[PDB]
Amino acid sequence: QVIYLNPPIEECRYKLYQEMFAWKMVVLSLPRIQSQRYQVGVHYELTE
Amino acid sequence: SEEEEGQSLWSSILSEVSTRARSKLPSGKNILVFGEDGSGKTTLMTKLQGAEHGKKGRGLEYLYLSVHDEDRDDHTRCNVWILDGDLYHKGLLKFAVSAESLPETLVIFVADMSRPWTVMESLQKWASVLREHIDKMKIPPEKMRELERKFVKDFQDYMEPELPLGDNVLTHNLGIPVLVVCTKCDAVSVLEKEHDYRDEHLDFIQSHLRRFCLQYGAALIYTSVKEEKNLDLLYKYIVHKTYGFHFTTPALVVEKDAVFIPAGWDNEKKIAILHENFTTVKPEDAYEDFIVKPPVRKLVHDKELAAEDEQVFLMKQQSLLAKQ
């Protein structure tokens, strides 16, 4: 007699936020242009 | 109207009979984490939930700090969020925060030793942002002073888990559930070895962190990613603060990896006891005096390859021929 949710509403909100974030990453995931990749001399790592 | 009163009577009876499933969890539990960018707080929050996700979505998130209320075998969550340097996203709290959320305020903080001095500065910046957010509420200040009195009582109630206030006891008056952590201390030995983070210097860093925390009225827990120090202790403290659980383990200062002094378990003299340990440097030694700003990686500066322009070299050679 104690109703519940499948899933919790907080879980649904988190899923929706994750979906929006994935949509944003659909654009943002494109790497910055590796113009410095032509330059050599240091075996560093490109930032975000 | 009459039907409104009837359904209201129904709801009143529901609230009255709700004692069968009452005291389940703190209703409207939602959390926050302060700071600037580069915190790496995704892993910290994942370990906090015990989960693991590298989904470092920029801005913030509605991080679901699932509050398994196992003491009563109930369950809940906590809508947590993290803070970055995205001042363009300063309006996140406008989306995030609320007047009820102002009563339901829950904040967190952590550490990163790379710019630990600036991490103090970044904490100050995040605090300024939070104060700006608090001001942006423009809410009933009578309730603000009431909650301030309640929090001041809690600080007075913050006894040793077996009086007058300080000069700046929460000078940055948080007035809200705020957490801090001396987390991510993995490279502490590397910091001493390379960055000259002396043992006296590291202790002074911890003491100044405590001093600033008290100036904000705050408490922190030392941790590292591989250490996973005080994670269950952090959860217990969170439940004790918001959910009102009973914190069990006594706070200690001996544990270098998991230094978690309880709030109100120390005072100004306890910090002053640590303040005498500043042997080599003066007791008021600046973090900037101990800060490190190494200019690594030799940032380009590729000579600005250019020469005389079209009309420019035209006039240059014209004057040259005038000489010639």
d(CA B149, CA B143): 10
Q: Tell me whether residue B276 is in a domain.
A: yes
Tokens of B81: 């969020």
Q: Is residue B46 part of a domain?
A: yes
Q: What are phi and psi of B83, to 5 degrees?
A: -115, 140
Answer whether A10 sits within 8 Å of B64, measured CB to CB.
yes
User: Residue B222: phi, psi to the nearest 5?
Assistant: -75, 140
Distance from CA of A15 to the nearest CA of B (A): 9
The whole-angstrom separation of Cα B223 and Cα B181 is: 7
What is residue B64's DSSP assignment?
E
B63 contact residues in A (CB cutoff 8 A) = 14
What's CA B177's distance to the chain center, in Å? Answer: 11
- In angstroms, rounded to a whole number, what is the distance separating the alpha carbons of residues B137 and B266? 32
Residue numbers in B near A36 (CB within 8 A): 300
The torsion defined by the Cα of B12, B15, B18 and B22, in degrees rounded to 10, comes to -170
Give the range of the structural domain holding residue B263, as residue numbers without chain letter: 26-291
Q: How far apart are alpha carbons B222 and B224 in whole angstroms?
A: 7
| B283 prior amide bond cis, ω within 30 | no
Residue showing tokens 């699932």 = B66
Q: What are phi and psi of B157, to 5 degrees?
A: -70, -15
Q: Contact, A10 vs B79, CB < 8 A?
A: yes
Type of residue at B138: K
Task: Give strand pairing partners of B107.
Answer: B178
Whether residue A18 contacts residue B54, with contact meaning beta carbons closer than 8 Å, is answered with no
Tell me whether residue B100 is annotated as binding. no
User: Is B112 annotated to bind ligand?
Assistant: no
Q: Can you say how many angstroms the Cα of residue B116 is from the centroid of all Cα atoms in its chain?
A: 13
To the question of whether residue B40 is assigned a binding role by annotation, the answer is yes
User: How many Å apart are CA B141 and CA B241, to the nearest integer?
Assistant: 23
Evaluate whether residue B53 is within a structural domain: yes
Chain B touched by A7 (CB under 8 Å): no
Q: Which one-letter DSSP state was computed for residue B79?
A: E
Find out whether B219 and B180 touch, Cβ atoms under 8 Å. yes
B/e letters for A2-26, b = 16+ CB within 10 Å, e = fewer, are eeeeeeeebeeebeebbeebeeeee
Helix (H) or strand (E) segment spanning residue B211: helix B199-216
Cβ atoms of B59 and B85 closer than 8 Å: no
User: Which DSSP letter does residue B178 get?
Assistant: B
Q: Token digits for B180?
A: 């801090």
How far is the alpha carbon of B298 from chain A, nearest alpha carbon, in Å? 9
Choose among B65, B79, B69: nearest CA to B22: B69
| SS3 of residue A46 by DSSP | coil
Q: Helix, strand, or coil here: A38?
A: helix
Return the closest-CA partner of residue B39 out of B66, B60, B62.
Answer: B60
Give B59-64's long-range contacts (Cβ < 8 A, gap of 24+).
B59/B84, B59/B86, B59/B89, B59/B92, B60/B84, B60/B89, B60/B92, B60/B96, B61/A17, B61/A21, B62/A13, B62/A14, B62/A17, B63/A14, B63/B31, B64/A10, B64/A11, B64/A13, B64/A14
Q: CB B154: neighbour CB atoms within 10 A?
A: 13
Resolution of this model in Å is: 6.2
Torsion B182-B184-B188-B194 (CA) sign: negative
Q: How far apart are the CA of A32 and the nearest CA of chain B, in angstroms?
A: 16
Sequence-separated (6 or more) residues with CB below 8 Å from residue B250: B161
Distance CA B6, CA B8 (A): 5
Task: Go through chain A and tell me how many residues it has.
Answer: 48
Residue that is written with structure tokens 């109100």 in the block: B264
| Phi-psi label, residue B139: left if phi above 0, alpha if psi -120 to 50, beta otherwise | beta
Of B26, B210, B56, the closest CA to residue B120 belongs to B210
How far apart, in whole angstroms, are the C-alpha atoms of residue B144 and residue B152?
A: 12
Chain B residue with the nearest C-alpha to that of A29: B57
**Least CA distance to B79: which residue of chain A?**
A10
Report the C-alpha gap between B176 and B241 in whole angstroms.
Answer: 10
d(CA B250, CA B94): 38
List for chain B the helix, strand, coil content (%; round to 5). 45, 5, 55
Number of domains in chain B: 1
Residues B292 and B76: their CA atoms lie apart, in Å, by: 43
Distance CA B206, CA B47 (A): 23
Among the listed residues B108, B127, B115, the one whose alpha carbon sits nearest the alpha carbon of residue B215: B127
Q: Which of residues 63-92 of B touch A (CB under 8 A)?
A: 63-64, 77, 79
Using a CB-CB distance cutoff of 8 angstroms, which residues of chain B are in contact with residue A24?
57-58
Q: Residue B286 falls within a domain, yes or no? A: yes
Residues with Cβ within 8 Å of residue B105, at least 6 apart in sequence: B32, B97, B176, B177
C-alpha to C-alpha distance for B110 and B186, rounded to whole angstroms: 13
Contacts of B319 (CB under 8 A, 6+ apart): none
B37 touches B85 (CB < 8 A): yes
Beta strand residue intervals within chain B, DSSP E: 63-64, 79-80
Nearest partner of B238 among B182, B173, B179, judged by Cα: B179
Tell me the backbone φ, ψ of residue B63, rounded to 5 degrees: -60, 125
Does residue B148 lie within any of the structural domains?
yes
Does residue B1 lie within any of the structural domains?
no
Task: In whole angstroms, give the CA distance from residue B249 to residue B260.
Answer: 11
B262 with B219: CB under 8 angstroms?
Answer: yes
CB-based contact B139:B245 (threshold 8 Å): no
Question: Is B20 contained in some domain?
Answer: no
